[PDB]
Amino acid sequence: MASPLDQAIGLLIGIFHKYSGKEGDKHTLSKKELKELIQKELTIGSKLQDAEIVKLMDDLDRNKDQEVNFQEYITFLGALAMIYNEALKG
Template identity: 55%
Template structure:
């Protein structure tokens, strides 16, 4: 049986392919596919009411090779950055808890 980390990696890969398979290149996310993934799978992005300009900045930052699509490597790098942001949030939150004691 797979451990939690292995399951998380599988979810990451399957989620990418769930959206990349909808149109065009089946191994890359178009702008529309990426936007749908962000809204449905990372609702905190939607809660910020991501406007078109903000989304375009995200797309430009992720699309390292400038082919107007996001491949799995670019997506995985993005998730790594999101994970690092979560880690920083939890470190700060933990330190605030320790200071209150």
């Protein structure tokens, strides 16, 4: 795996489990990881600009006590990307 076309998804998997070094093993981003993540790259890259009140939405990991699975991670990334990456609604 990690052949260019797959490697592209590999990047998303990358960011996901980048926040798993501090988790011992390649599991769910257990709380600290997510709250460390959301403030860094999540939204408009490592620039953010988006408000605390937006982050208060994507804290959505709340759904299942902040142990974020790839699905859960992808949920907010999806929601946000549908805005920030706009070539979807237009």
